Amino acid sequence: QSMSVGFIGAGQLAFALAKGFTAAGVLAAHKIMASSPDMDLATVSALRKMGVKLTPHNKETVQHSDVLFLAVKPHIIPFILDEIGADIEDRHIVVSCAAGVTISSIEKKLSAFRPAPRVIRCMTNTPVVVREGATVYATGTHAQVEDGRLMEQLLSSVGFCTEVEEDLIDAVTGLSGSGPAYAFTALDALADGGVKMGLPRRLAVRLGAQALLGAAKMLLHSEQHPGQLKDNVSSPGGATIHALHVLESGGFRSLLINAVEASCIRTRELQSMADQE
Amino acid sequence: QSMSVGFIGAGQLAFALAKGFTAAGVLAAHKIMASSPDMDLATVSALRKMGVKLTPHNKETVQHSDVLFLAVKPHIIPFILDEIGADIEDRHIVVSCAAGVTISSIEKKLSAFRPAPRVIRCMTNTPVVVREGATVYATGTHAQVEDGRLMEQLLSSVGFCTEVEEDLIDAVTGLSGSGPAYAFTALDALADGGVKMGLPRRLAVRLGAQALLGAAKMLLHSEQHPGQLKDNVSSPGGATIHALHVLESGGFRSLLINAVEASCIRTRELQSMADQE
Amino acid sequence: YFQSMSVGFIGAGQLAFALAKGFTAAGVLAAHKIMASSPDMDLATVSALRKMGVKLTPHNKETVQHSDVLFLAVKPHIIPFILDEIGADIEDRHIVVSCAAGVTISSIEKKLSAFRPAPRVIRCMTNTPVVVREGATVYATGTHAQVEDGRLMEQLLSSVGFCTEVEEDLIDAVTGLSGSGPAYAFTALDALADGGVKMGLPRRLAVRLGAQALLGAAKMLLHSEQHPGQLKDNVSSPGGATIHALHVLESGGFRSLLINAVEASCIRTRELQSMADQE
Amino acid sequence: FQSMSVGFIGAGQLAFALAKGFTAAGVLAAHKIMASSPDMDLATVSALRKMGVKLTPHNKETVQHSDVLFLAVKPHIIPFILDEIGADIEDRHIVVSCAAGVTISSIEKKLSAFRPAPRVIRCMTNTPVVVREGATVYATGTHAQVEDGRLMEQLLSSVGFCTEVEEDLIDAVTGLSGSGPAYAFTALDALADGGVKMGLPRRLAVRLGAQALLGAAKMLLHSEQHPGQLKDNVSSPGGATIHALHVLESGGFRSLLINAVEASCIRTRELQSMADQE
Ligand SMILES: NC(=O)C1=CN([C@@H]2O[C@H](COP(=O)(O)OP(=O)(O)OC[C@H]3O[C@@H](n4cnc5c(N)ncnc54)[C@H](O)[C@@H]3O)[C@@H](O)[C@H]2O)C=CC1
Ligand SMILES: NC(=O)C1=CN([C@@H]2O[C@H](COP(=O)(O)OP(=O)(O)OC[C@H]3O[C@@H](n4cnc5c(N)ncnc54)[C@H](O)[C@@H]3O)[C@@H](O)[C@H]2O)C=CC1
Ligand SMILES: NC(=O)C1=CN([C@@H]2O[C@H](COP(=O)(O)OP(=O)(O)OC[C@H]3O[C@@H](n4cnc5c(N)ncnc54)[C@H](O)[C@@H]3O)[C@@H](O)[C@H]2O)C=CC1
Ligand SMILES: NC(=O)C1=CN([C@@H]2O[C@H](COP(=O)(O)OP(=O)(O)OC[C@H]3O[C@@H](n4cnc5c(N)ncnc54)[C@H](O)[C@@H]3O)[C@@H](O)[C@H]2O)C=CC1
Ligand SMILES: O=C(O)[C@@H]1CCCCN1
Ligand SMILES: O=C(O)[C@@H]1CCCCN1
Ligand SMILES: O=C(O)[C@@H]1CCCCN1
Ligand SMILES: O=C(O)[C@@H]1CCCCN1
Predict the structure, then answer these.
(1) Edge-to-edge strands of the sheet including C95-98?
(2) Which of A172, B69, D178, D208 yields a CA-CA distance of 20 to 30 A from D134?
(3) Ligand 5 atom closest to residue B73's alpha carbon, by position in its atom list
(4) What does the alpha-carbon distance between residue B131 and residue B134 come to, in Å, rounded to a whole number?
(5) Sign of dihedral through CA atoms D105, D108, D110, D116?
(6) Phi then psi dihedrals of residue B122, to 5 deg
(7) Cβ-defined contact of D189 to A245 (cutoff 8 Å)
(8) Dihedral (CA of B168, B173, B176, B182) sign
(9) Is B105 helix (H, G, I), strand (E, B) or coil?
(10) B88 φ, ψ (degrees, to nearest 5)
């Protein structure tokens, strides 16, 4: 309750998490501060109306915060760590949200200034903004047991959250981190299919999104295999099995596997370049 | 509250709706009766444990019911209507859930026995079982205004529900009716992609489903275009835009359009055969 | 009982051989209580039937007079000529079992009813694995088949594999799945063997391992209540070799090709029978 | 062999499958079997419990209980396991590695640091051992005695086909019969969807497709004829089956199965190459 939260970066992810946290009630907007070198951002304007404290100065965010989220682009992380490293205290829990960036790389930058930085790495996604996020976290070398439990409590307020080994996170990034983009592409296309068959666009968007929401919820609430739930939809000779055939004829399943793989491979490739630098 | 509901048919759709209605609290299990010529069905066993009254005799379902759902396969509908047509009373609201079957065809069969049958046609989907269904309905020639409002009240308890013109329903069937099957295929494949990149299968299923649920919820709660929400996920040069490219290279969008179209075309084709018979 | 039943095959080809070998291997019938007829004795199937001890004759009337249960095992377009030829020889005691793809009970009963009013007709679809008593058989009973006729036919065909009664309107689809099925399987086993050879296995070992793998997986599914996707999930470890191989199957639309096959077989069956009904 | 104690290090899919097959075969009483795992909250551990298999978290307990010791852990866990119990391997032990890709030489090098001449056998099997129709190959290590191989072949023949091979074939066998059940399950799911599309109930389509594949596989195993000849026997000229074969050929059906065996084998070799660099 006395917990103060800070965001280095004031972009899409910082907005989504601050919106989710405040809607969840687990944090008052006034306990949150975010910093950015650009206050002319739509997300900065939104955070202001929410009641989040804003500043150009990353040092002010550090000084206000107990839990410090790093919500900048991955290549900005080392610059950020050099800038505020001398201002980290024993009270701080540093939570990196950046795609690809390793706990090792973060702990090495911070340890030059003060031993035993408490670091947690997470991967989440934009649906935390409607409290339906998918989040994983890995705890660092000096994180205490209460640090992981605190972070799971906080991130569970805005969706699914579980601890993982760090070597799983790049793959999670390709699945649930990039996942919403696959869904939005799919929903746009399903709506176009509805329009082609005679539905108004607004209705098609609503129906397609509601269908995907409900099916996903069924699977999360069921112990059955997704193929069994699929079997339950189709009648023999019917419309649904005819539609499933044309998906299969296009290699639909393989394209989704291709996407998760391509995201994960790019994440690893980018971090290799960072480590080489 | 005094309303009694009956299901002709005791299969996947009847279970899903009865489960959703009772979980919603809008109906007590004991106000529901369902009939089937086969009590050795898993769905019949499930309905029994819920507290739903079961019978082999469709006439008993009619006699108990105020609202009567037709939840049999489309080709069974005319047989069903011939069987119980003499038992429909002025109190009855007949709600056909059957894919493709027209209000005209139903009103013609029932009108031979008694004038002015009150008929509503709906299309829904299995996620009503977790109260996240997508339902549309069209009112028949003799349905009263309170009949449509009653049905929207009832079906809104288990998900989205809106009135449509009947000529939209076959297209809705290809989008949200068959939709859950597209989602389950997609979730199975996304999980395989997670497994390929090193995630345990149970975790990949959970993450993929949670990602699709959250993205769908974002779109339902946003006024923004799905392409804008997609743009918000990707950073320049990043993992997500790399993954979106490989989806595009496979014609991912076109496959989903193909599916909605194929389902809708099959539905129309099947009903043409029924009308020819 | 069963060994006292006389069985006849009109047609002495691949299906008659497969069934006669299955029945005799099962011990339900003595080979010499089977008679088969063909206008062509220079077939390999006739020679094999002869070596088993089946009675062979060129005269379909002899097969009819010999038999109690009479299997029609000729090509579908031959059935109406067969029915014209021996229809007058069908007796009240006969059970007539059509194995021909596509041919309807109605077409058979219309021919035979011109001779006697209540011909007992059963239609079945089976497959060549009856030869190792692992066939997949369905049957539908005709207008005049007694309840005991269906029970007898199920007992007989269960001796050489799986057997269940179905409505007749399912049989063309069954034909595209389990009737044509063994050919899809032999194609797949030939290709899996080539895959083993490409990766360095001797052909003989690759053939045996591929066939054992498919047999064991199919038996697993038949003995499990789990979805095939779940059994599939259990084979793969994260990042491992099996999931990499499943991806390249998916990239080629592997699933859609098998759906295409069942559909193509069933559509061709319906199309041929429509030409027969037109003729 | 009633004087034989079998142990599993690992209590996952493969250990369950083998234990269920051995016990169903009657060659082992379930109480003569011990399995270890650091995680007792697995579905496979509960199933092993109900069978009457002894469970323990301690790999050393499994080693002390067992004469034949199956390594049923993921390949990257093998070197850790060997470090943990290498000092407990006795002369009596036969160590049977089931792990994909892991070489006899790598196992022998680990165990030899503790006691010379470890008796090592490498095998590749598959999950259908659970219905006693597995396909297993094995290779004997440097110090395996002649009777060690014969004993293993007797034990593994009780749950399916089993033959000795040169070790350099095992990665390819892994891509064919090791991964093979997954190809079949994919095919059976798809064939069932095909049956449903043409009007069959799903339960019936699943049963018929599985029976068709089982019977055709048995036909081939029992026949001296080429699979092409058995295929030819199914088709009549102009008929339904040859029409269906054509659409398989037009999609390169054969090439996809070759692709799968190749992709599995290449990945196995790639993974072990990384293990050997580490
Ligand atoms: N957008 C998404 O869907 C998700 C993004 N992420 C991660 O979140 C991090 C940020 O992602 P987005 O918010 O999408 O980026 P974004 O580009 O919307 O916001 C980036 C923010 O960093 C600020 N910034 C740049 N230099 C700075 C500095 N020196 N000090 C402080 N702030 C600075 C920018 O002004 C902007 O406010 C990335 O590492 C990304 O991998 C992870 C999960 C999902
Ligand atoms: N499964 C789905 O996803 C949805 C299905 N529907 C529609 O719901 C209707 C039923 O669909 P499912 O429940 O999936 O079918 P289902 O096959 O699971 O259940 C069909 C039920 O009808 C019963 N039945 C057969 N003959 C009968 C008779 N003479 N009298 C009474 N009951 C009889 C069967 O025994 C079975 O209980 C279909 O028209 C379908 O289009 C619509 C929305 C979604
Ligand atoms: N081969 C298979 O895998 C299966 C075939 N079937 C059905 O079995 C029937 C026969 O198929 P196959 O045995 O494969 O054909 P096949 O061509 O091997 O043998 C056909 C037999 O009919 C004989 N025949 C031709 N004219 C005749 C006549 N007037 N009187 C008597 N016999 C005559 C031929 O000489 C030959 O012995 C077909 O209707 C086919 O659909 C059904 C299930 C599987
Ligand atoms: N599943 C299959 O279809 C086949 C698997 N294999 C091989 O069998 C081995 C196991 O495969 P699955 O059983 O499928 O894996 P699985 O993941 O189902 O079970 C793995 C087991 O290892 C246990 N484990 C992890 N660390 C351990 C440790 N330090 N000490 C003891 N147990 C530990 C886990 O708790 C789990 O019980 C792999 O090397 C695989 O290549 C070979 C043939 C077929
Ligand atoms: O495949 C079918 O016959 C049905 C039609 C309606 C929505 C669900 N699936
Ligand atoms: O495209 C990107 O850079 C990020 C990576 C992490 C998840 C969201 N998208
Ligand atoms: O996918 C895997 O890791 C294993 C390899 C061995 C055979 C079965 N599947
Ligand atoms: O190709 C054919 O004509 C037959 C039809 C029946 C099943 C087996 N093959």
Answers:
(1) C55-57, C34-37, C7-10, C69-72, C95-98, C120-125, C135-141, C161-165
(2) D208
(3) 3
(4) 9
(5) negative
(6) -130, 160
(7) no
(8) negative
(9) helix
(10) -75, 135
